[PDB]
Design a protein around this ligand. Structure first.
Ligand SMILES: Nc1nc2c(ncn2[C@@H]2O[C@H](COP(=O)(O)OP(=O)(O)OP(=O)(O)O)[C@@H](O)[C@H]2O)c(=O)[nH]1
Ligand SMILES: CN[C@@H]1CCc2c(ccc(O)c2O)[C@H]1O
Lengths: 333, 231, 281, 55
């Protein structure tokens, strides 16, 4: 019981330290910037063919092809420009909760309630290539670090880095208390962050194999996380209908995004090319467009008949695509 | 130029395959099998067969598809099961004198399932296993249910009670008391959107599949009746 | 004096049907196999209210047909077509409800989007076969002196038919789509009562008028609207000089009003309410 | 158990010592980056329909 006193003493010490470094709030500095203004968008393409609700999607590195997964047990690779299909890969397990597209464009991975991550080969038709096992809980997200190693986060309060060629775990990241829900990698692929179910987002270093920092601004479960293009900040979305912009060097949050007319949860968060606009999905059957530096809403992306569960922006910053439980994908511009 | 034609041909082939698969997807009914530990969830599944353990059966040219999950106090993955036909709940009725007695935990789990936001319109088929173990302990038994449940004193056998042949007037009271402890939590917050079907199950029983079939048919019929505003 | 009420009836018929058609077409969530029949009924009612009602009002107010024989025959044929096509759709809707309720496990396979179009086109074909064919070519004409006298006149546009056609059209249009509806709704009511009784037996202690009321509106409005006309129609042919022209046209015009109540009856779902709130609000 | 409390103590001890900068500098850096990449994203500024690949 000595530790409870000890740990409590340290937590008190850090809070004073972060506090001293507050020369001024970001809203104080960002007060005279000309507003972005109203942002009007219209849907350009509508992709149909899915039998059930959609949970995940991921844009290709060429801003041309994308992948999506549904509860019908089927991955489909579309063609954004010509709105026609390219591939359709069946699945052994009908419950999938994530998908990813390799940076080289040769592999696609997916996981689900069954505790296995599967990798498919697209440039041989398409047949399962490798099955990775070892997690004791359902997978939540997975991202391709490179063409030979993949990092996954599961529901058993752990994250791990895999080796595709050998199929064995290389490093294991522990320290969370509740389930892990999402992650995002640094642009230079040296660090990544994860949002847990205990309202705490942590920073990891694959090379260090050890946690570096922790942020505890929220008060409910964390559903999604996105990383600022600079590499020194990230944004989070939780179940308390709020978005918060954290920071790495300052080691404390800067601004919060919320409105009094919305009481629903948040499902996805993404940035734009320049990082000026923060696009976030909601459970209110539509999407909102925020302002990164002033926290003023500048548009609404409506048109979905059910909740939005996916959101992604092309590497070229040309179009933003959304997914919903209505089994329909859209391309906005 | 011909690349567009080849891509269109591939699109057409994929579309034909998807159209073929759509009917098979719509034909089947999906069931979720949920219960506590030592409940008997695996067994009932074995009788139907003759990380997630799937199974399929076909009755009267109608095919069903059952899923058994799993271990966490909060289940976030339960939001993915809002399109199932029904949820099968399995509880051990004889464990009121074991280990926070196992029943009260089962009651709390059932209450948590019933009031979940994502499962507002999902019916629950309730199975009461170990009927045999309960009677041997309940009658010609060392201990009473009262000690573990004070409300048993102010409870009378329901008049509607319909005892099967050869059973004592105490074991019937115990069985119907256990059933009413679940029926109370079901009736109060439903709003008529969803219902519960109590049942009595033992190890030597062969009519479970027919019961599930009849319950699914009743659920579908009641949903259709409510949709058209006749109920 | 009558012009105001006739214009109000025409506007009421047109507005609801066009609103329902637009709501079904614009939004993809309402595109259901059941909603195709409602769409066909809406088109039939819109065509009726746009074609036969205004010219009938003009004829009754003016008391003199200002067109030729061809236009009068065309108007009569389109009247018969619309009236015939506006009832078999109701019968099909009742049969669809019967199949959906009493056969829950086979509703999905039996009724598909491919069969609905075939059924709708078959209904329209059988409706048009008994309206344009026997009227446009002269088989509805009568032989008595007043009939031929009106036929000769270029400004006389009235209604005179033989026993055979007057009986066949009534049998095809009303009674066959009536006995089926009665049987279907009796069976549906029995099933609903059984379900309610089972619910009460299962859990009545802790906790049949809605179905009765719904069937009450659904059957009563149609029966009261279309019943007396389709008996006076047979009566005035089976024997002569009993039914006055004014009472006949009054009952016929009473029957016309039924095409304006269907949007208020078959489109009361909350999804339709939010759809109607989405636009024009 | 006791160790799980103990582990928190060592790591928390690590987080305590870290080089931190004033939030004004970080805010200025974010503002400068956003102003530097301001005119190179079609989402913020609607580009003409000639170069739009979706039209
Ligand atoms: N006496 C008795 N044993 C039973 C009954 N039902 C199941 N069992 C026994 O229970 C043993 C193992 O527990 P099960 O009841 O199968 O339940 P389980 O699926 O293993 O347990 P959980 O999944 O943790 O709920 C089996 O070997 C069965 O013989 C029953 O009604 N009476
Ligand atoms: C001019 N009004 C017509 C005349 C006769 C007729 C009607 C409707 C259905 C029929 O089967 C008929 O024979 C009426 O609507």
């Amino acid at each position: 019981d000595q530790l409870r006193q000890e740990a409590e003493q340290l937590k008190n010490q850090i809070r004073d330290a972060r506090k001293a470094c507050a020369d001024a709030t970001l809203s104080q500095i960002t007060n005279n910037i000309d507003p972005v203004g109203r942002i009007q968008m219209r849907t350009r393409r509508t992709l149909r063919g899915h039998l059930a609700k959609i949970y995940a999607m991921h844009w290709g590195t060429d801003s041309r092809l994308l992948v999506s997964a549904s509860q019908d047990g089927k991955l489909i690779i579309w063609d954004s420009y010509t709105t026609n299909k390219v591939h359709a890969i069946p699945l052994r397990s009908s419950w999938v909760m994530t998908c990813a597209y390799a940076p080289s464009g040769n592999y696609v991975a997916c996981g689900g309630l069954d505790n296995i991550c599967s990798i498919y080969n697209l440039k041989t038709n398409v047949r399962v290539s490798r099955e990775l096992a070892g997690h004791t809980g359902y997978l939540s997200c997975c991202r391709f670090l490179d063409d030979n190693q993949i990092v996954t986060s599961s529901g058993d309060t752990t994250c791990a880095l895999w080796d595709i060629e050998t199929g064995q775990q290389t490093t294991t990241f522990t320290g969370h208390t509740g389930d892990v829900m999402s992650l995002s990698l640094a642009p230079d692929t040296r660090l990544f962050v994860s949002g847990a179910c205990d309202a705490s987002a942590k920073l990891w270093d694959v090379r260090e194999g050890m946690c570096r920092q922790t942020f505890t601004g929220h008060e409910s479960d964390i559903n999604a996380i996105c990383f600022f293009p600079n590499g020194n900040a990230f944004a989070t979305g939780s179940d308390d209908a709020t978005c918060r912009l954290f920071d790495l060097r300052a080691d404390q949050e800067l601004m919060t995004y919320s409105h009094d007319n919305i009481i629903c949860g948040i499902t996805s968060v993404s940035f734009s090319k320049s990082g000026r606009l923060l696009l976030a999905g909601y459970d209110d059957f539509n999407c909102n467009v925020w302002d990164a530096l002033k926290a003023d809403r500048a548009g609404v992306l409506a048109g979905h008949d059910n909740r939005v569960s996916c959101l992604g922006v092309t590497d070229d910053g040309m179009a933003v695509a959304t997914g919903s439980w209505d089994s329909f994908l859209k391309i906005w511009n | 130029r011909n690349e567009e034609k080849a891509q269109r041909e591939a699109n057409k082939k994929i579309e034909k395959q998807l159209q073929k698969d759509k009917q098979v997807y719509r034909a089947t009914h999906r069931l979720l099998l949920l219960g506590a530990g030592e409940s008997g969830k695996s067994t009932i599944v074995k009788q139907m067969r003759i990380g997630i353990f799937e199974t399929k059966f076909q009755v009267d040219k109608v095919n069903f598809h059952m899923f058994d999950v799993g271990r966490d106090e909060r289940r976030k993955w339960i939001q993915c099961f809002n399109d199932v036909t029904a949820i099968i709940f399995v509880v051990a009725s004889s464990s009121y004198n074991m280990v926070t007695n196992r029943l009260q935990e089962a009651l709390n789990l059932f209450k948590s399932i019933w009031n979940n936001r994502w499962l507002r319109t999902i019916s629950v088929i309730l199975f009461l296993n170990k009927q045999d173990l309960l009677a041997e302990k309940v009658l010609a038994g060392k201990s009473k249910i009262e000690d573990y449940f004070p409300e048993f004193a102010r409870y009378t056998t329901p008049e509607d009670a319909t005892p099967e042949p050869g059973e004592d007037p105490r074991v019937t009271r115990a069985k119907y008391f256990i059933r009413d402890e679940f029926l109370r939590i079901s009736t109060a917050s439903g709003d008529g959107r969803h219902y519960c079907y109590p049942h009595f199950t033992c190890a030597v029983d062969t009519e479970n599949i027919r019961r599930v079939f009849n319950d699914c048919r009743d659920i579908i019929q009641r949903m259709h009746l409510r949709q058209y505003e006749l109920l | 004096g009558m012009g105001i009420v006739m214009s109000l009836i025409v506007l009421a018929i047109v507005f609801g049907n066009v609103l329902v058609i637009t709501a079904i077409a614009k939004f993809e969530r309402l595109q259901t196999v059941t909603n195709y029949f409602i769409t066909s009924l809406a088109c039939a009612d819109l065509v009726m209210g746009l074609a036969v009602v205004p010219f009938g009002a003009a004829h009754i107010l003016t008391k003199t047909w200002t067109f030729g024989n061809f236009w009068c025959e065309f108007w009569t044929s389109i009247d018969v077509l619309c009236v015939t096509a506006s009832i078999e759709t109701l019968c099909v809707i009742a049969v669809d409800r019967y199949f959906a309720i009493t056969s829950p496990f086979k509703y999905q396979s039996l009724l598909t989007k491919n069969k609905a179009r075939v059924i709708i086109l078959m209904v329209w074909i059988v409706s048009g076969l008994t309206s344009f064919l026997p009227i446009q070519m002269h088989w509805y004409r009568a032989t008595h002196q007043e009939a031929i006298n009106c036929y000769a006149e270029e400004t006389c546009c009235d209604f005179f038919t033989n026993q055979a056609y007057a009986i066949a059209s009534s049998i095809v249009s009303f009674y066959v789509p009536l006995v089926i509806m009665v049987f279907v709704y009796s069976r549906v009511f029995q099933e609903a009562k059984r379900q309610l009784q089972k619910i009460d037996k299962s859990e009545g202690r802790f906790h049949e008028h809605k179905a009765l009321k719904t069937l009450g509106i659904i059957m009563g409005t149609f029966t009261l609207c279309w019943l007396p006309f389709f008996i006076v129609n047979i009566v005035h042919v089976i024997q002569d000089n009993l039914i006055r022209k004014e009472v006949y046209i009054l009952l016929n015009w009473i029957g016309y009003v039924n095409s304006g109540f269907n949007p208020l009856i078959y489109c009361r779902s909350p999804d339709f309410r939010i759809a109607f709130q989405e636009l024009l609000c | 158990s006791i160790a799980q409390a103990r582990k928190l103590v060592e790591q928390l001890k690590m987080e305590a010592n870290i080089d931190r900068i004033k939030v004004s500098k970080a805010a200025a850096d974010l503002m400068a980056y956003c102003e530097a990449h301001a005119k190179e994203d079609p989402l913020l500024t609607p580009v003409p329909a000639s170069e739009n690949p979706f039209r």
